Design brief:
Radius of gyration of chain E: 22 Å
Order of helices and strands of chain E: HHHHH
Structural class of chain A: mainly alpha
Largest interface: C-F, 42 and 38 residues
Shape of chain E: flat
Number of helices of chain E: 5
Structural class of chain E: mainly alpha
Chains: A mainly alpha, B alpha+beta, C alpha+beta, D mainly alpha, E mainly alpha, F alpha+beta
Distance between the termini of chain E: 48 Å
Oligomer: part of a larger assembly
Strand content of chain A: under 5%
Number of strands of chain A: 0
Largest sheet of chain A: none
Radius of gyration of chain A: 28 Å
Strand content of chain E: under 5%
Order of helices and strands of chain A: HHHH
C-alpha cells in the first residue's frame, strides 16, 4: 500500500503541473501562431515522419571543396554564364515544353 | 503478490495458445486443486479466454493481472458466453 | 453471343475497377508453360503495362515445385527519362527479383511525381512573373528570381529516392544564388542555417503553404 | 478488506500509468512546435528584411556586377547540367502526339 | 517559320559551346565522380553532343512537315 | 467471326487478370463486395497470400477476412478505411509483406541453418522480436536479439548480440560480434548466415 500510495500520488500531481504547463504553453503558441498569420496566409499533401530534415542537405558545399581551383572554377563558370547562346537554348527549351502543360 | 501464493502453471500450445492453469488459495490455506480455473492467452492479441467455474470469487484480480502482464491498459468483459471453445475461436477472430 | 458479350462487358468493368484500384493498366499478357521433371514447372509471363504517366515492359520466368514457388529470372525495360535513379532502382530490384514491392514503389514514385508536377503548375499559375521554369513542371527543381533584380535567386530541389528495403521518400533542399553584396549589407547572416530551418518549416506546415508564404515575403 | 484495497489501489495505478505518457508527449511536441515556429518566424522576418534591403540597394545601383561565392555554386551548375535528355523526351512526346 | 532559323543558329553555336566547355579541365575532372552526379540528378557529361544535335534535325524537319501540333463517391463514380 | 473475336477478347482479359494477380494484389468483385486477395513475396520467393471480404455499402464493414488478427488493422481501419481507401490498402499490403518476409526468414532459418544452432529460437507471432543463440566454428558462442519495431520494413533497427559465462579475451571475437551486428542491421538473416558459414 505505502509504495503504491506513494508512487501514484506524485505522478498525478506531476500530471496536474504538466496539465497547467501545457495549457499555458497552448495559450502561448496560440497567440504566437497568430503572429505568423500577420503576413502569411491561413492556408492535398502528406507530411513525412520527421525523416525529411535528417540527411545533410549541403553536402555539396563540401564536395566543391575537393575540386581544384574552386575560385577559378567560379570565374570560368561566370564567363560561361554571360554567354547568350545557352540562355537562348534554355528559353527555347522552356518554350518547347510550355505547350506540354 | 495477489495475496501470498497461488498455484500457477503455464503450457505453450500451437497457434500461440498459452494455456494457464490457476488454483486459488487464501492467506492461510494451500491453494485448492479441486476448484481450478483456466485462462487462454494469445500473444500480441486483444482477446483472451477464461473458464469461469469459481472466478466469480475474485474476478478483478485476474483481469488486472492479465492486463498488466499484457502491457495493456483497458480491460473489459464482453457479454459473450459459450461452451464450444473452437467456435468461439472462429467467431472472435472471424476465422470461419 | 449477347449473353457472352454482356458477361465480357461486366468482367471488363470489374477489371477496369481493379485497374483503378491499383493505378496500373497492363496492356498485354503472354503466358508460356514448360515442365521439367527429374514436378518442376517453369512459367513465363510477358507483359507491357503503364502507370498514369509512365510506360514499362517486363518479362519474368517463375518456377513451381511439387508446394513452393519462386521466380527464376526476369528482364524489364523502362523509358528514358531524366530520373536516372529510377533505372538503377529497377536494376537493383531486378537482382532482387521482387515484383510487389517494385510495383508499389513505382506507384508511390509516380504519386509523388504527380503531386510535384501539380504543385509546380499551381504555383506557376498563381504567380507567373516570379516563377521561372528552369527545366519544366516535370523537373526536379524550381527557381524563383526577381525580374527587376536578377542577383537573387532561390532554387528548391526535389528528389525522390528509394530505400534499400523498397521504401520511398522525397527530399527537398534549398539553395540561394545570392551576391555577397547583400551579405555585406546585412550582418544578421541567417542564410547559414537556411536549409534546416526551411525543412523544419515545411515539416510544420507542408510544402505548398511554405512556398506560398515564401513568395508572399517576396512581394 | 486489505485484499479489496489491493484491488482498488492496483486499478488506480494501472489507470493512471498510461495517463502520464500522452500528456508528456503532447507537452514535448508542443514545446518543440513553439520553438520551431518562433525560429521560423525569426528567419522569415530576417530574410524579408534582407530582400527589402537588397531591393532598395539594387534600385540605388543596379548596374554594379553581382559576384557570387561557392555557397551558390552547386545549384548554378544545375542549370549548366544540360544533356538534351529533357529535350529528347520532349521530342519523343512530340513524335507520340503527331499521330 | 522562325524555328528553321533558330535551329540553324543553335547548330552553328554548337561548335563554340563545345569549345567553351573544353576550355577548362576542372569540369572534366569533376566527371567520373558520381558524388555530384547523384546530387544534380542524372550526370554531367556532354561528349556525344554532335550525335544528338545532328539527330534532332531530321525529327524537327519531320515535325515541320507533318505539323504534329472521399472514398465512397470516388468508388461509386467508377461502377457507373 | 464474332464468336472468335469474343473468345479472343475473353482470353486477352483473362491473361490481363492473371497478370494483375501476379503483381501487387488481387480483387474478385462479388455481389456483397470484393474478396480482395493480397499477395506476399520477398527476395523473389513467393509467399502465402491472404484475402479479405468487403461490403460496398456506405457503412463499410469487414464481414469476413483471412488476415491473422495479430496484424493491427482496426486502428488502420479507423485511420484510412473510411477515407483514402487506396492508402489503406497500400499500407496493409506493406504490413502483410513485411510480416510474410519475417516469417519466411524465421522458418527458413529453422529448417535450413539449424545445424549450427544450439537452441530453439523464441519468436512472436508478429516476429517483431527475435531471440536465439548460435555457435559458429575456432568456435564462438553468441546470443542475438533483434527488434523489428519498424513494422513496415523487413529489416531490424536495433540488434544486440552477447554471451554469458565467457569473459572477453580476444579482440577478434568482438570483431565478429560487431560484424554480425552490422550484418543483421543491414542485410537479411539467412543471406548473411550463408555468407559467413560458407
Amino acid at each position: 500500500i505505502d509504495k503504491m500510495v506513494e508512487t501514484t500520488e506524485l505522478m498525478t500531481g506531476n500530471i496536474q503541473s504538466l496539465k497547467n504547463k501545457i495549457q499555458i504553453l497552448a495559450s502561448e503558441v496560440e497567440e504566437e501562431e497568430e503572429r505568423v498569420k500577420q503576413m502569411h496566409q491561413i492556408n492535398l499533401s502528406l507530411p513525412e515522419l520527421s525523416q525529411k530534415t535528417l540527411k545533410a542537405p549541403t553536402l555539396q558545399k563540401e564536395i566543391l571543396a575537393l575540386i581544384p581551383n574552386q575560385n577559378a572554377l567560379l570565374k570560368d563558370l561566370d564567363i560561361l554564364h554571360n554567354s547568350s547562346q545557352m540562355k537562348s537554348m534554355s528559353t527555347f527549351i522552356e518554350e518547347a515544353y510550355k505547350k506540354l502543360d | 503478490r495477489a495475496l501470498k501464493n497461488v498455484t500457477v502453471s503455464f503450457r505453450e500450445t500451437e497457434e500461440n495458445a498459452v494455456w494457464i492453469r490457476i488454483a486459488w488459495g487464501t492467506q492461510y490455506t494451500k491453494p485448492n486443486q479441486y476448484k481450478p480455473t483456466y485462462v487462454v492467452y494469445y500473444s500480441q492479441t486483444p482477446y483472451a479466454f477464461t473458464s469461469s467455474s469459481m472466478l466469480r470469487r475474485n474476478t478483478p484480480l485476474l483481469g488486472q493481472a492479465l492486463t498488466i502482464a499484457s502491457k495493456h491498459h483497458q480491460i473489459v468483459k464482453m457479454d459473450l458466453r459459450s461452451r464450444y471453445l473452437d467456435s468461439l475461436k472462429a467467431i472472435v477472430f472471424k476465422q470461419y | 453471343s449477347k449473353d457472352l458479350k454482356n458477361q465480357l462487358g461486366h468482367l471488363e468493368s470489374e477489371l477496369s475497377f481493379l485497374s483503378t484500384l491499383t493505378g496500373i493498366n497492363i496492356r498485354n499478357h503472354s503466358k508460356q508453360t514448360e515442365d521439367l521433371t527429374s514436378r518442376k514447372v517453369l512459367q513465363r509471363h510477358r507483359l507491357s503495362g503503364n502507370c498514369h504517366m509512365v510506360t514499362f515492359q517486363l518479362e519474368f520466368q517463375i518456377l513451381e515445385i511439387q508446394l513452393s514457388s519462386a521466380v527464376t529470372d526476369l528482364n524489364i525495360i523502362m523509358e528514358p527519362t531524366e530520373c536516372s535513379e529510377l533505372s538503377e532502382f529497377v536494376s537493383r530490384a531486378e537482382e532482387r527479383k521482387d515484383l510487389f514491392m517494385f510495383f508499389r514503389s513505382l506507384h508511390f514514385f509516380v504519386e509523388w511525381f504527380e503531386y510535384r508536377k501539380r504543385t509546380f503548375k499551381h504555383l506557376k499559375e498563381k504567380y507567373p512573373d516570379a516563377v521561372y521554369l528552369s527545366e519544366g513542371p516535370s523537373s526536379c527543381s524550381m527557381g524563383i528570381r526577381s525580374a527587376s533584380r536578377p542577383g537573387f535567386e532561390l532554387v528548391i530541389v526535389w528528389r525522390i529516392q528509394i530505400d534499400e528495403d523498397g521504401k520511398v521518400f522525397p527530399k527537398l533542399d534549398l539553395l540561394t544564388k545570392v551576391p555577397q553584396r547583400a551579405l555585406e549589407l546585412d550582418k544578421n547572416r541567417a542564410i547559414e542555417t537556411a536549409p534546416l530551418s526551411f525543412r523544419t518549416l515545411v515539416g510544420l506546415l507542408g510544402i505548398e503553404a511554405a512556398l506560398e508564404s515564401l513568395i508572399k515575403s517576396l512581394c | 478488506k486489505k485484499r479489496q484495497r489491493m484491488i482498488e489501489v492496483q486499478d488506480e495505478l494501472l489507470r493512471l500509468e498510461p495517463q502520464l505518457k500522452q500528456l508528456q508527449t503532447k507537452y514535448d511536441e508542443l514545446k518543440e512546435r513553439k520553438s520551431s515556429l518562433r525560429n521560423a518566424a525569426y528567419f522569415l522576418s530576417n530574410l524579408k528584411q534582407l530582400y527589402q534591403d537588397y531591393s532598395d540597394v539594387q534600385a540605388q545601383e543596379p548596374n554594379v556586377k553581382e559576384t557570387y561565392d561557392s555557397s551558390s555554386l552547386p545549384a548554378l551548375l544545375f542549370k549548366a547540367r544540360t544533356l538534351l535528355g529533357a529535350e529528347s523526351h520532349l521530342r519523343n512526346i512530340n513524335h507520340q502526339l503527331e499521330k | 517559320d522562325e524555328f528553321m532559323m533558330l535551329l540553324s543558329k543553335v547548330e552553328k553555336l554548337s561548335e563554340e559551346i563545345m569549345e567553351i566547355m573544353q576550355n577548362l579541365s576542372s569540369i572534366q575532372a569533376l566527371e567520373g565522380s558520381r558524388e555530384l552526379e547523384n546530387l544534380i540528378g542524372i550526370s554531367c557529361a556532354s561528349h556525344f553532343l554532335k550525335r544528338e544535335m545532328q539527330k534532332t534535325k531530321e525529327l524537327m524537319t519531320k515535325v515541320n512537315k507533318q505539323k504534329l501540333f472521399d472514398s465512397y463517391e470516388f468508388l461509386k463514380a467508377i461502377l457507373n | 467471326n464474332e464468336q472468335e473475336a469474343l473468345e479472343e477478347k475473353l482470353e486477352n482479359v483473362k491473361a490481363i487478370l492473371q497478370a494483375y494477380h501476379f503483381t501487387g494484389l488481387s480483387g474478385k468483385l462479388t455481389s456483397r463486395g470484393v474478396c480482395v486477395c493480397i499477395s506476399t513475396a520477398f527476395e523473389g520467393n513467393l509467399l502465402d497470400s491472404y484475402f479479405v471480404d468487403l461490403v460496398i455499402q456506405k457503412p463499410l464493414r469487414i464481414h469476413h477476412h483471412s488476415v491473422p488478427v495479430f496484424i493491427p488493422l482496426e486502428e488502420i481501419a479507423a485511420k484510412y478505411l473510411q477515407t483514402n481507401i487506396q492508402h489503406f490498402l497500400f499500407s496493409l499490403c506493406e504490413y502483410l509483406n513485411a510480416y510474410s518476409g519475417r516469417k519466411y526468414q524465421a522458418d527458413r532459418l529453422q529448417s535450413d541453418f539449424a545445424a549450427l544452432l544450439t537452441g530453439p529460437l523464441q519468436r512472436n507471432p508478429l516476429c517483431n522480436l527475435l531471440s536465439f543463440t548460435y555457435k559458429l566454428d575456432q568456435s564462438f558462442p553468441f546470443c542475438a536479439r533483434l527488434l523489428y519495431k519498424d513494422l513496415t520494413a523487413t529489416l531490424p533497427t536495433d540488434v544486440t548480440v552477447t554471451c554469458q559465462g565467457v569473459e572477453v579475451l580476444s579482440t577478434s571475437w568482438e570483431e565478429q560480434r560487431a560484424s554480425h551486428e552490422t550484418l543483421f542491421c543491414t542485410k537479411p538473416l539467412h543471406q548473411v548466415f550463408a555468407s559467413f558459414t560458407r
